[PDB]
Enzyme design. Structure first.
Site, short mmCIF file in Angstrom:
data_model
loop_
_atom_site.label_atom_id
_atom_site.label_comp_id
_atom_site.label_asym_id
_atom_site.label_seq_id
_atom_site.Cartn_x
_atom_site.Cartn_y
_atom_site.Cartn_z
N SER A 291 0.85 -1.15 0.00
CA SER A 291 0.00 0.00 0.00
C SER A 291 0.94 1.27 0.00
O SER A 291 1.90 1.35 -0.84
CB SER A 291 -0.96 -0.08 1.19
OG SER A 291 -2.08 0.84 1.00
N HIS B 220 -7.06 -5.07 -2.41
CA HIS B 220 -5.94 -4.41 -1.74
C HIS B 220 -5.14 -5.22 -0.66
O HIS B 220 -5.68 -5.59 0.35
CB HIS B 220 -6.45 -3.11 -1.11
CG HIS B 220 -5.37 -2.15 -0.76
ND1 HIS B 220 -4.45 -1.70 -1.68
CD2 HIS B 220 -5.07 -1.54 0.41
CE1 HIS B 220 -3.64 -0.82 -1.10
NE2 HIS B 220 -3.99 -0.71 0.17
N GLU C 176 -9.00 -3.67 -7.33
CA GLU C 176 -8.60 -2.49 -6.59
C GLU C 176 -8.53 -1.23 -7.34
O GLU C 176 -8.21 -1.15 -8.51
CB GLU C 176 -7.28 -2.59 -5.84
CG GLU C 176 -6.29 -3.68 -6.05
CD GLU C 176 -5.09 -3.50 -5.05
OE1 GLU C 176 -4.93 -2.38 -4.43
OE2 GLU C 176 -4.30 -4.47 -4.89
#
Length: 296
Positions: free
Chosen positions: A143, A267, A237
């Site tokens: 991320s 994600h 995502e």
């Protein structure tokens, strides 16, 4: 689409705060702490401080000495901790048979950009000073953390530091502008990332900085000279495009890039290994790649 992902998605929509409610920061920080999975109990841990930051050496069984992973946790540059990510990284230690250095790097809004990059760079330097050879090192992150992986490589290269053998961005957030088509295109399938939410993070992190600064948004950086990349992203995502465009920038820039879009995945689906076969297999694969790159 496996039963688990269908089921996991339902649980995640069922648990979610409704779209565009504003959850206070410390309330999201605590919430992410209490829902964190426990690490497997064969994962050994040792607390250390690295360039002024708390960190853990996280060692599964099977670790080769001499080898290490600098790991950069997700959390939007505003949340996350050694505790939120100890589990998933434990398993990356398992599959790659390398101990992981899990850094509790400075978070916004108390320490805005470029604070987290300084911490990542300094943690990398630290590893080199301990006598880990670059060819025995890897950098991985999820991320925001996967963006930071790249920002760390770029900033380290600019400063004359040698590159490690491999780098593995998982679901990287590599473009603070959040303009990519997949914010619209993949929005219904993504149970995991609202915007407004992702935009507030950026705002708190940049704190007035250029959103196109190479170290904040490495999708705009010069990637020339970086070592081989495994990029993992989920087809479902909002961040698909960051990863497609990253892989394209890297290829254009001379970098050996392998981008895998794993269909039906969300994600950082890795984080859900305990209940998700694909979470498990993607982790096995991060491990395999770190090891292929080291055997080379």
């Amino acid at each position: 689409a496996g039963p688990e992902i269908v089921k996991l998605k339902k649980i995640l929509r069922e648990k979610a705060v409704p779209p565009g409610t504003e959850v206070p920061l410390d309330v999201m920080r605590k919430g992410m702490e209490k829902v964190a999975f426990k690490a497997a109990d064969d994962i050994q841990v040792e607390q250390v401080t690295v360039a002024g930051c708390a960190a853990e050496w996280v060692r599964a069984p099977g670790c080769q000495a001499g080898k290490a992973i600098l790991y950069l946790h997700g959390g939007g540059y505003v949340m996350g901790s050694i505790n939120t990510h100890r589990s998933m990284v434990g398993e990356i230690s398992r599959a790659s048979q390398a101990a992981a250095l899990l850094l509790d790097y400075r978070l916004a809004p108390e320490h805005p950009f470029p604070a987290a990059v300084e911490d990542g760079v300094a943690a990398y330097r630290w590893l080199l000073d301990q006598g880990f050879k670059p060819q025995h090192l890897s950098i991985s992150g999820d991320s925001a953390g996967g963006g930071l992986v790249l920002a760390v490589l770029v900033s380290a290269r600019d400063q004359g530091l040698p590159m490690p053998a491999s780098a593995i961005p998982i679901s990287p957030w590599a473009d603070m502008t959040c303009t990519n088509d997949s914010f619209k295109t993949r929005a219904e399938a993504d149970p995991m990332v609202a915007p407004g939410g992702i935009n507030k993070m950026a705002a708190r992190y940049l704190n007035g900085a250029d959103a196109k600064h190479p170290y904040a948004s490495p999708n705009f950086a010069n990637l020339k000279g970086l070592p081989p990349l495994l990029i993992h992203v989920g087809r479902d995502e909002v961040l698909l495009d960051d990863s497609i465009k990253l892989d394209a920038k890297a290829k254009a820039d001379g970098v050996k890039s392998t981008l895998e879009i794993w269909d039906d995945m969300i994600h950082v689906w890795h984080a859900f290994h305990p209940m998700l076969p694909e979470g498990k297999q993607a982790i096995v694969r991060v491990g395999e790649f770190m090891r292929e790159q080291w055997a080379a």
